[PDB]
Amino acid sequence: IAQARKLVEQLKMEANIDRIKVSKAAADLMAYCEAHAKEDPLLTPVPASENPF
Amino acid sequence: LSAEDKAAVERSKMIDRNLREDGEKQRREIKLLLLGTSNSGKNTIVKQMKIIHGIVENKFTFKELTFKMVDVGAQRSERKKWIHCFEGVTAIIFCVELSGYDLKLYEDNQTSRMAASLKLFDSICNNKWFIDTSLILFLNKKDLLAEKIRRIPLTICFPEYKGQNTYEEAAVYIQRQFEDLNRNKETKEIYSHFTCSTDTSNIQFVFDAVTDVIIQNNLKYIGLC
Amino acid sequence: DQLRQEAEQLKNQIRDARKACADATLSQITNNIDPVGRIQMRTRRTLRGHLAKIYAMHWGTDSRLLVSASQDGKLIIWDSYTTNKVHAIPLRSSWVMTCAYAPSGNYVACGGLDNICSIYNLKTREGNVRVSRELAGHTGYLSCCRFLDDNQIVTSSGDTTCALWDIETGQQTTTFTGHTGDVMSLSLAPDTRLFVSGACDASAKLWDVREGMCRQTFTGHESDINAICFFPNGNAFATGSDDATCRLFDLRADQELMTYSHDNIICGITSVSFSKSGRLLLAGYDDFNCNVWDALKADRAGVLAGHDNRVSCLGVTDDGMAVATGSWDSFLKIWN
Amino acid sequence: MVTAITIMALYSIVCVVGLFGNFLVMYVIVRYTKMKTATNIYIFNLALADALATSTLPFQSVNYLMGTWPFGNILCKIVISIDYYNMFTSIFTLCTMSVDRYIAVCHPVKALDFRTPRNAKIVNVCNWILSSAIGLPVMFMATTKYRQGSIDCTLTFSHPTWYWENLLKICVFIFAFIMPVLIITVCYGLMILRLKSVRMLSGSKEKDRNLRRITRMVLVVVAVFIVCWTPIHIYVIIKALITIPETTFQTVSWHFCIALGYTNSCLNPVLYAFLDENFKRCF
Amino acid sequence: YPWF
């Protein structure tokens, strides 16, 4: 009986949170990927002179 | 090329040498995963083999062969998430309470502790990580079975049992029931033994079974199988 | 009695809110960007010396030092540039399944089936590495551990509970509960204020370290979750699962965004990690190799096929210079 | 003319079987097995010895063709040394594989301490040196003599000739036929007697089939060695006791015995590599 | 083995 009420209160806390449309957060992820695209040796291979491997 | 670089390389090489030495020693050790239900007799058997003459790891030597038994009894978690790290174990030791066919209490009631042992044996013997891994099946407390078989009938646990209620028939029937769950007969072998508190019989059986397993593995290695 | 159906109604309302929240799901908006193209990462270093299955590795924050754990009962600190072994730490229990590297570099942590998180002092006096703290209190198996700082470490165990420890005292300061299955992986946020844990419930929970309370719950996987890691900005995370599916969840949208799957892949995920930009998601598989996914396209960009056994661990340097993959064949490879 | 061409053809086929079988074994070892197992090390050594022994053949075939040696003193020495050295190395590698299997079966606990690739390399090197102990004396001791119309590869005769000839023949007979036969027979008999008690073999019909299969390989290997090496040694001993007139039948029998001795090395890769279950898994 |  305690597990049930604990689950209910957990769902109460989870339900009452602010949501933003996925078109906005996905756009934010895309913008983050675009802004930091240059600083990614795996994404953009680095010249061997400054490659430490 | 630098002096400190050469010193670092030398330290790395010494570490490599110590790693190789440690690895030879680890290889010379025979690991035996110890499995069983609650009150099955795992700990008692370990103590017997020690005094015959989390994880509780027990290491002991017999006839110049070093056994390393690994017991995971105290752990409470799902077994498939960690049974894979015991892959490649030399053998598995399974302990069965031979007199526990009517001691089904465990949690709540109607737990069928003997059937619990049967289901655990089905789970581990047919496990995908132990297809080629043999099992050493120990049947514990046979005296209790002998003194209870004439009072409590075995049919209380196996309603399909047909035969006399005498110790030998019960022991053979239970051995056959534990061996018939081995659905991979051409890839692994089950060694059955009736444990006794005497002068080095359990450890002798373990030594013989491990010797046979080593012979089979060598036959695989030398290219004859 | 009323609690069960009111909880069902609560879950229905949460699902309705999430469904109303979704309108694009990364598919109708990332089709206008150029594909990453084919990526060929070549092996640079091969770290030899482990003599059993390698279960965990963790890069140091300097992107040069590296720690690995194997069933040998050995923790090895590697110099990735020179392949030199800085340290070889023996373990009291060889059944180790996780390892961590302190962000300061002073400590490494390892844990496994011994129900104990051991803290090892690396940069100490007297020379050799010595064990400092053994954190006991978990009742399952430690599947992951992560350092918050030199004194705070978070662990996930097989007893369905995650814990936060004060290393100096050796006691749990807060316990994270709510999972009903073995918690298998962890990932700290970039600011170390939140963390996500994936469990055998096919669910990932976002916890708050300060209050020790679960903030969000993410579902969508059909099997056990084995790996988890945040996006670089900390507003999203990716999970790996036994059903051969990787998914990208969203903290602010509180729902799954992208799914990374292939018909030819039937083996579960052992480890996931992001590149420094977050555009590439690297996942380790049971089919003995690694797949490089386009995190915004769900397209498969490359394969790191260099291991003869299951790839069990994987990490990317803090500067994004290299990827280290460790597998059950007792080898680590560095790809660049 | 017909006898000579028969000898040449048989010899050429023997050479072909030796060269291609051993080179295929080499390629498989260097591409798939990765020289990481003691048995693979032993198979590699056996293949090398057999390949060099078979490579000795064409010089001998040409010599018998023209009745002369056209290759000079230096070549005469290296060919003689290679022949003796590689016969000894092949026989000793057969013995070493037999003893390795005997240890792996009848002494399993100690095989954990011993059966490692490093020990396999050590024993290989030791066998090569032990065979060098006879390859080098004949390397320095072989010479080229001149006759009226022929050039022959022979060996210098330190006085007396009869004592030295008997000593060399007895040493080769003992350390190349009697000792290997005794070693392999004893080791394989004990190994079979032990394998009859293995519970994974003395089981169901499939396990009995496995046991019969293993016994079949063991017995066929022993029989191949005996049938391939007994006739030539017996015949050369018979020739050394009683002089044999030179006829067509005597010549064809002599060359057939030589060819059989070399077909031993030709068959060795078939028995020890192709029928090895580790190789069968290599696709 | 013997030379011819």
Author numbering:
A (entry chain G): 9 to 61
B (entry chain A): 5 to 57, 183 to 354
C (entry chain B): 5 to 340
D (entry chain R): 65 to 347
E (entry chain P): 1 to 4
Can you quote the paper on this entry?
Activation of the μ-opioid receptor (μOR) alleviates pain but also elicits adverse effects through diverse G proteins and β-arrestins. Here, we present the cryo-EM structures of the μOR–Gz and μOR–βarr1 complexes, revealing selective conformational preferences of μOR when engaged with specific downstream signaling transducers. Integrated receptor pharmacology, including high-resolution structural analysis, cell signaling assays, and molecular dynamics simulations, demonstrated that transmembrane helix 1 (TM1) acts as an allosteric regulator of μOR signaling bias through differential stabilization of the Gi-, Gz-, and βarr1-bound states.
To further understand μOR–Gz coupling and signal transduction, we prepared DAMGO- and endomorphin-1-bound μOR with dominant-negative Gz for structural determination. The μOR–Gz complexes were purified with scFv16 to facilitate cryo-EM studies, which yielded 2.8-Å DAMGO–μOR–Gz and endomorphin-1–μOR–Gz density maps with clear densities for DAMGO, endomorphin-1, and most side chains of μOR and Gz. The overall architecture of μOR–Gz closely resembles that of μOR–Gi (root-mean-square deviation (RMSD) of 1.0 Å for Cα). The α5 helix of Gi/z inserts into a similarly sized intracellular pocket of μOR (about 11.3 Å in width, measured by the distance between Cα of I6.33 and E8.48). For the βarr1-coupled µOR, the most evident changes compared to the Gi-bound µOR are a 3.0-Å upward displacement of helix8, a 1.3-Å outward movement of the TM7–helix8 hinge in the cytoplasm, and a 1.1-Å net inward displacement of the entire TM1 segment; the TM1 inward displacement is 0.7 Å relative to the µOR bound to Gz. In the endomorphin-1–µOR–βarr1 complex, the B-factor of TM1 is similar to other transmembrane segments, whereas it is significantly higher in the endomorphin-1–µOR–Gz complex. The Phe4 of endomorphin-1 fits into this pocket and participates in the dynamic regulation of downstream signaling by TM1.
